[PDB]
Amino acid sequence: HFHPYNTLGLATQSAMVGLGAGVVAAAARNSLATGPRNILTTFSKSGGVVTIFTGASIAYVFTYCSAANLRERKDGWNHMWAGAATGAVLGARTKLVPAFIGWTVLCGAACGLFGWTGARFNADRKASLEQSPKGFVQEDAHQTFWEVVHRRPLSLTVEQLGEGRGINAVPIATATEAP
Amino acid sequence: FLTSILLSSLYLFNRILAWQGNVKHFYLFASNLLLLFIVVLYINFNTFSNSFQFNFELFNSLNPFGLSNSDISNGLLFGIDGLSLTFILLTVLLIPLTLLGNWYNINFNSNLYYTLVLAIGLVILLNFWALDYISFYILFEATLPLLFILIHIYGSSDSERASFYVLMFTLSGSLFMLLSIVVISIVLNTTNFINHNLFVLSLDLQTIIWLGLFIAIMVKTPLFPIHVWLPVVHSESPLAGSMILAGLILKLALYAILRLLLPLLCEAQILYTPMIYIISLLTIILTSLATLRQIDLKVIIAYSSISHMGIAILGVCSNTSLGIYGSIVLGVAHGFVSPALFLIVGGILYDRYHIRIVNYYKGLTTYMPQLATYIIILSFANIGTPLTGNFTGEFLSLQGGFIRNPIIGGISCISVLLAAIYQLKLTNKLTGGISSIYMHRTNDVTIREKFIMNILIISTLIIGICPQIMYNLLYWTVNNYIYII
Amino acid sequence: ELKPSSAIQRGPLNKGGWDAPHALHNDGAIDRYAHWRTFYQERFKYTRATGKSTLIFLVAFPALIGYVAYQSEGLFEFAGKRRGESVTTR
Amino acid sequence: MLILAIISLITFVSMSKLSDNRAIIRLINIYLILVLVLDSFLYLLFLNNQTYTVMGELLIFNSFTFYIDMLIYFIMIVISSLYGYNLYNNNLYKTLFEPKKELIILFLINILGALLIVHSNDFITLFVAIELQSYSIYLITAIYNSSYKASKASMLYFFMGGILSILIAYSINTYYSVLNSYTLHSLDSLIINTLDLNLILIALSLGLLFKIGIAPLHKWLISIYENTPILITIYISLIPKISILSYLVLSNISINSLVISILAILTLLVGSVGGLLQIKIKRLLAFSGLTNAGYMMLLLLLNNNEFSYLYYITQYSISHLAIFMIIIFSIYYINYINNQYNPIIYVNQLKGLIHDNAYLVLSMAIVVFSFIGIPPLLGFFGKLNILMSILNNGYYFISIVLIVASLISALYYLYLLNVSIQDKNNILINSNETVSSVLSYILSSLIILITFGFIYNSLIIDIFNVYFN
Amino acid sequence: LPLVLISLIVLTISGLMIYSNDSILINKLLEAFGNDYNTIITQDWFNIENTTLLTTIGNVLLTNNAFILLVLAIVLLLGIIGPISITMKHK
Amino acid sequence: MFIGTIILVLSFLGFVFNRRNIILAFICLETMLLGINLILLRNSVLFDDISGSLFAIVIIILAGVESAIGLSLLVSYYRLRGVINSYGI
Ligand SMILES: CCCCCCCCCCC(CCCCCCCCCC)(CO[C@H]1O[C@@H](CO)[C@H](O[C@@H]2O[C@@H](CO)[C@H](O)[C@@H](O)[C@@H]2O)[C@@H](O)[C@@H]1O)CO[C@H]1O[C@@H](CO)[C@H](O[C@@H]2O[C@@H](CO)[C@H](O)[C@@H](O)[C@@H]2O)[C@@H](O)[C@H]1O
Ligand SMILES: CCCCC/C=C/C/C=C/CCCCCCCC(=O)O[C@H](COC(=O)CCCCCCCCCCCCCCC)COP(=O)(O)OCC[N+](C)(C)C
Incomplete structure (x- = not known):
């Protein structure tokens, strides 16, 4: 199944990596600049960069692990909620309410589309079509993903779709026959 | 033989360009020859066969330039059933009317314009012949550069933004269409309109594949989330661009949802028809409501076309024979009656006064009585006023949508009211009142405009008095796409 | 010293044809009003009335008829029914 | 037969006067044609x-690399036609499009160094060929030395190529320090599991890739391409790209590298916007x-990517070549x-290019819509066959980022x-005066390839099926 | 200086990293310092002649990697042609 | 490996944070090549083979040719501007 997340310590680890990334990026902006700049203008003329890094890190991993622990399953919806929280933190530097809402919903939609494709930049190996069973089944078996058959079982049709609209467990013809 | 026909024909074309500056006579001649050829094909068509009758393969490896008689086939297939031939007849009787529609207003660089218009018509003609997914898709987007060049060079003040939107939104939906087509071609290793109901995919692979095709159909039969390029690409196009667009492109995507989705996404489609009903009711109501506050005149007929395509989509997605038939009748009758309305607003009204704002036009009956006759006859024909073909399509599509879900059928039946409010609100403003103090009196409607109007009105009235005249093509394809186990 | 060639003979562009006399007296107020309405979106801004309209028509009404459409899919058959017979299924 | 041409050519060019340079290039043009044909x-x-x-085991010759050398010769025939033929016989285009004395020398030495990368099996052949082609791009950039921008660009390109050559050398000797070997033929499917060659091989690929212009380090190359003259930059944009890729x-x-996928996403993002x-x-x-x-960085993640690669290579080469030649032709019509x-x-x-030579705009429109990927044209099947390899192999977020990047890039096309x-x-x-018959025929050939090259797709797939499988 | 210090420590440790084969990050690092063991040099009498190192460089530049020597001749040729081609101003 | 690694790293960082003149960039490039040489020749000695010595004798020649090429490039940079800036090119 799944096992519950360490929201405490993953959020501490995320705050550590965000602090380090803010240190590195503030040093990078210091070195790549003009004007009178010294060693302690790294945190005064930084442009608020450590706040960006740490706030995004705490917000995303807190909301991700909390949503995965509240829903008790793991899919791309947790990436949607965590990206909504990250967009909230990135949109609060904009001191404006409609832009804040735009940052929230659009970053959450982009991160949910990210987390729905697998939440991986790279590939999954066995989930690929190259490294999976493909083509026809050669004789009758549970049809996997990436596989094609000629006929499907009708019990699978009734269980997956339903028993409602035009769909029935026995066809209309043989349900109405003379004997 | 067949090569000598063509280099005779290329020499024919070169000589008449050398002696006559214009092309338009030969383009009209080739259009009417194409008409006669398609009707000779309809004579030789076997209605008793479900299969594809007039097949040909292009760009095979054994014969790259020409036809293919081979054991192995990897080119592009072409062929027709009754469903294809319905839209081919509708297409081929509209191509000469759009070449005729700009017979005098395009003055500066005419030959470019008529070549672009005939080229777009030929691409959309070949769209309905195609039999692979990649052969459908190649012609399905060959239109877009020609549309971009046509809308950008010719148009009103704002033809740059309209040309950009007709490339942008169409390309953006149709790229996700290409995503799903690539997934189909790497699972099945075949793209084919013949075999493709035999293959069964997994349910969650089907529900992934179905999304990208439906997003492109939502862009091109413009349903509510993106319905939005359409008023600006209409309101700023030239005349034949508007006519070809709203008579053929929207019905082409209506054809694509039958041809591409209903055969191999059946078990997906049943899971998703409530979402389609959300989107189609929500693009009937909200677009039919947003037409009431419009200052411009071609934009009203653009939003009208949105509402009628929203009626047709809940006919195809109804899982009913009545809904499929009514969506086909709606598409064909709409492709008749709506280019006549775009001619009323863009040809008889923009050639004379060169403005399109509603506030200048009042009391057009007292100087133009037969234009006003046309305006009221076309208004009622567009509403869903019966004996017109529009009511046959709207009635059978609303009935199928009532079978599949009765509550969304109940709230979709108010489209009869909503479609009439804005149309009659426009029509009584145009016809009624004292004549406008802004408009100086011009000519009444001319012989060619009355000719185009009379053809596009008779062809709605014949379908409206007897919709059986094209059942002989469709009675297979009305049973073909039904999944009721 | 870099001038395009002496052998250009370039001249002015004309559209060609007939100058149609003006059938319509322009109205400056109607033209300004309509140019204002056509390009309304580049001056559009988010307000409270805007937010009310956006939430009511883009999220609230889709969620409402979505709830109605998903609750009522296989409910009703009315095809052949009689007095004392159910017309729903669940 | 490149070696013959270089050996013959510098002998012949030392004895020619500067009046003869253009005719020398014409000679070499025809020479390369008969190396293709015969x-x-x-x-x-x-x-x-x-x-x-x-x-x-020093050089490796397969059919992939045979196709790459055929492509490089075809492009060199086009470029050498652009130098060796006059546009017009004005006193204008003689002071604009003028070859130096030693230009075709450096061209053929760079084509040599570009071939010895694709044909290469060991790492020192790779190194020596990379520096041969790098010094040649330094000198091709610096050969029009009466120009402030080209001088500054050659200096910048020297230093930024020196760093990224020392990074390749560090990765090669770092690979040598863990394996007493020079081949990647050494790897053979089992060593990669039990050995961490990830950091080595990825640092090698990165040091090779930053010379193309991949995204964190892209701006210096954009500045070199803007600062070089218009004839030099059509050659130095294409040849290191196709050789190193x-x-x-x-x-x-x-x-399936995570770093190459990060930088490919970032490359598609930062190039489009x-x-x-x-x-x-x-x-x-x-x-x-x-x-x-x-x-292409996308196809680097792939196993068995030789169709999508070679198709999109000759696609991009023809489209690239044609869009630079069209704006060579538009110089006659500008007011400034x-x-x-x-x-x-x-x-x-x-x-106003449609009102002066409208068929140049027909040319331009064809190659721009093929850049976008419009289906009757040749760029569409390149993007299509890239997608067929991306989706086959599990790169699902990469696919949507590819699509959004192509939609954003369509704007500035x-x-x-x-x-x-x-x-x-x-x-x-x-x-009064006409554009070159010899040289406008080349642009028309490059267009007819782009528009009517979808005809031969099934022929090309069958010939592919026999010579690569 | 702050990025100098960060890049010094990072690039230094990272250059020390790739001499190691562990799954483990700092077992990769501290195997670079596991240096302390004194190599045992043995005499074997299998070599009969004064092939020193310059002799074997001359054998393998000239037989097994002769092509590298000739492409290197092209590189030396380029180092002649290029500086001349820049700095002459032909007439 | 220590001496080659640290001359390469310190040489690299002296190249990167060079803001004072241009020839410090050239000599930091050459000392980078020296550090690469040091690492490789140590590996050749430790592995008992000439092949690292082969790549080292080839990269000596390539470093020389790059110095000749690039210093002629600086001379042509200097032809039109009779000054070389302190901040850089
Ligand atoms: C604008 C339109 C956007 C459209 C985007 C749609 C993208 C949706 C992707 C769907 C899809 C790729 C299919 C794509 C095919 C073509 C796609 C076309 C291009 C798309 C660009 C990626 O599936 C992903 O779904 C994610 C959630 O949905 C998961 O997230 C993560 O969740 C948690 C992980 O444990 C993490 O803890 C959390 O951190 C993550 O978040 C991922 O793990 C998962 O890989 C599904 O592939 C996969 O499906 C499965 C189950 O059938 C198949 O199962 C196998 O086969 C059967 C017997 O063998 C059995 O039944 C099945 O048991 C067996 O295992 C696989 O073979 C595989 O193929
Ligand atoms: C006398 C002839 C002298 C030799 C002429 C050679 C010129 C080299 C030119 C290169 C650029 C021009 C494109 C030409 C593409 C040729 C396709 C091809 O044939 O390449 C093959 C497939 O390529 C692949 O996988 C993928 C290739 C993708 C091609 C995509 C572009 C398609 C449209 C342009 C090509 C068709 C034009 C035909 C016009 C009649 C692979 O290599 P091959 O060992 O079988 O080559 C044999 C060609 N021979 C017999 C003429 C030497």
């Missing part, structure tokens, strides 16, 4: 993916190369020639069209 029957060597190693596609050392608000045509034209090199080396700069200078189909006040009617 000598390509060597494709019969490579039946059923038969691969040779030559000079003691044809090395890294043939050697599959970054399969980077060239949006840009008003110089070579800038606009170089961010196109940034995105189209991103589409600055900057003798780079006579057209701003993209608004081609504004169509901006060229939007400028050229516009009204202009003073249009041409009658011009």
